[PDB]
Symmetry: C5
Subunit: 198 residues, 5 copies
Amino acid sequence: LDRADILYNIRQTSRPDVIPTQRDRPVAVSVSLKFINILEVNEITNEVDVVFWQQTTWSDRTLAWNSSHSPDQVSVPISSLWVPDLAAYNAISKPEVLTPQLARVVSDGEVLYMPSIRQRFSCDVSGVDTESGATCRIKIGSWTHHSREISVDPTSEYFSQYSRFEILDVTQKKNSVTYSCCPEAYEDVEVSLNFRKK
Amino acid sequence: LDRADILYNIRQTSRPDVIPTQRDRPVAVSVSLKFINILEVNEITNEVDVVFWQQTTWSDRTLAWNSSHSPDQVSVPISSLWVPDLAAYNAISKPEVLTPQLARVVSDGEVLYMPSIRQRFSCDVSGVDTESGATCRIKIGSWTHHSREISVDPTSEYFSQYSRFEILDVTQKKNSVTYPEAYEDVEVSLNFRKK
Amino acid sequence: LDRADILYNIRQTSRPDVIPTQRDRPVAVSVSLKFINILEVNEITNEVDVVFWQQTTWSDRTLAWNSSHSPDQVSVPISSLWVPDLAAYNAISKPEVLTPQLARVVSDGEVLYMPSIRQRFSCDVSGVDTESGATCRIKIGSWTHHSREISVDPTSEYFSQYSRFEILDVTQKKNSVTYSCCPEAYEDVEVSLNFRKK
Amino acid sequence: LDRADILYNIRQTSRPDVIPTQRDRPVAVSVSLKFINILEVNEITNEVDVVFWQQTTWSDRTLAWNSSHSPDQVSVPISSLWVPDLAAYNAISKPEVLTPQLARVVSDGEVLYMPSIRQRFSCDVSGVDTESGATCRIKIGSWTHHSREISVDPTDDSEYFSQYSRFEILDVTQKKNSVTYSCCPEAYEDVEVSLNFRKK
Amino acid sequence: LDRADILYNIRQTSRPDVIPTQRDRPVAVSVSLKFINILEVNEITNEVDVVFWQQTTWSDRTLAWNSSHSPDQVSVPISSLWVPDLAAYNAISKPEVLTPQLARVVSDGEVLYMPSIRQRFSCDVSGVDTESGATCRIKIGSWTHHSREISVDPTSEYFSQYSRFEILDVTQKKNSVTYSCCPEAYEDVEVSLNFRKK
Ligand SMILES: N#Cc1cccc(-c2nc(-c3cccnc3)no2)c1
Ligand SMILES: *[C@@H]1O[C@H](CO)[C@@H](O)[C@H](O)[C@H]1NC(C)=O
């Protein structure tokens, strides 16, 4: 097997529309935001403009191959893969993807998709000039899949030294809520960005 | 039947261009706006910038399958489905869809499409600082189908605590307008004010 | 015949690239602008931002069908139809189409396409505060077809109550223009928008 | 032959990726800008916002047909034609095409493509309020083809210019440059368009 | 062989999704930025708006042909070629490509892709009024390929005389970075732009 063969098969056989549920268990999706820049902040309107790398990760065994005398990994266009329908609940602009839309696929079916995204959010900007800082919370989950089809889970350093802002702390936490309407839990990852102006 | 089969069949058979009229009766489409944010308001120009979840609902039985030992629901790209040509009559910008363009399809043919949309409207903004508040009305209906092909019908809580504004009341009511055929719309009245 | 069959045939046998000239006569295209909103006006730069419904209407016999026990009309994506290459000569932005790109087709081949468009124009804005008002002229014609392939012809009420402006008068008249580069003539419809600030 | 047949054949065969070199001669491409509007000008940043009709003409005999009892011309979507990869060297925004993307094709293979474009440029804006006016130069050439594959050539100045612009045109001149660099042994042609304009 | 044949074969065969690794050696990609304009600068937010020609060079032996009595080169749409997934690490806007998306392909398989790009970056703008000038660093590397799949390597004159700024110096150097999350090196080219206001 060479790269050409692996990518040929992936393209011919993968079903982007089909969630790779294994066994009627949820697909375990891991999400982790690496903040790169805070670009525009408005304490009056409570709106932030952020650049982050959305480290996403999951498994699709229909992509697997025997890497015996073969590449262990390939880069694959995401249009040829199933991808989690993740959305930020408090986003107020379309996610503007800044990077090549490729995912990294390992021979066992592990997939890493880490786009660089610029997006605006509605969050708490109060205290951004305070030393103690503002804390902006961003919630990311599947837009249409519930906890038994997709589970989301969590997993400062790549942040721009030239930003007008700096990061005090970032915490990532998972919410699971059960409602009266529905028998299923809804999962999201809440990312708390503690930042202030320099 | 597994998900792969269901999505394979939906894709191979579904005619997105073809309104799922059952019987020469209208397709019953339900619309309900869940406001999430009021972002920019202008009392001079009478223009608002709004973020809402457009809960849209209908039946397309050509999508149905026997869910005996099968999933009861799947997520389907809307490009593979027929979708109501709904438009906001008083919108003044393109609807900017913020979410994955998927719809949720139940084995009986029930379809739920609930995109998150950011859009600008021309409406009455007067009184927004008044604590009686402004009342902005948004009308949504089919752009090309009349009441016998498509009927629209109606059906605060998910609104952002961090908005500069707050919601006093939201009412949804249905109009039918004849200019030889009736065109229905849903009128959504958004009563809001600045904090 | 049901809707599915009609749309199937239209899709399989329409020729979006082919002007439905019948007979070596021009295709009679009717244009009529229904103004909905005047959004941004600048008397210094002489630029207006307008929202209108472009009631475009014309015939194409090759779409026709026998509506005996069949629907008399269907909604058809414009990508599956021939559409007049109409342009606004004094437009200074791309036409931003706000509505579903569908046209209404009658069984005799009559086609109605009425998109809602937001567009900026270069026109006379002088007198917009005067109560006599400004008069902005917009010219619409085929971009590449001359008067023997396409003829354009003409045909306040839907205008927004909440606009900063109001409409005094709208008149639509037809010109037949020859330019210097070219031997042939290009018809246009001139739309005069008399409006003022409230 | 009717329009349907001509457009059918053009589409089934025209090869948009393939420069219609005849004979190992360059394709003769004519360029001519007809200014329609000057929209925003900034003498500090030296940037202009311009609307122009880019009159573009060339031959492609693989499009030709015998117009005996047939239409002499047809309108053809440019996606079905080869089109010169012209770029403005000093452009600082994407060309925003305002018009239907059709070209006019004559039965002998002559092609006329004349889009209306709004674009921003980096040029000399100094003197725009002076009555002598500013002179903004715009250079247009093939982005990847050299002078032996593509040759560019020039063809009333205010004639289609907007009477409602804040600006007016004193003069427009079009001249042709040919440039050979030290990297590559090959000449690259451009058309330099000088726009002499001032505020009213 | 004529151009039509060469382009026909290139399009029928070449695989844009498949990195032209030859031997299990990295594809040697050369990057070199030719700055054309510095358009908008903000010493407060540390953000610059730049126009540059990204001279990108590499070899794809899959594209080769025998140029005996044939053209030595052709222009090919990049949608029909494999292209390095290069990204600017400190970019804060999408790359806006200003030129026709073609690459130049030589009969030996050498490929030159040199788009003109407008992009916004987060970099050090301090000292831009100082005569010593500011020094903005831009890092470009493969987004998903490591040093054994893709190596990047380096290689003022085309800069606009009408810019509000001028260039003191441009230096290009190569970094190789190995993280604690993956056993593998990721190369980038660091471009240092020394510029000041006139
Ligand atoms: N038959 C038909 C047909 C075809 C295309 C477009 C339209 C059209 N309907 C409306 C409209 C406005 C307000 C309320 N309801 C409908 N505006 O345009 C109608
Ligand atoms: C290339 O083609 C020809 C004949 O078609 C022959 O002259 C030449 O030696 C060939 N060379 C290659 C490297 O095969």
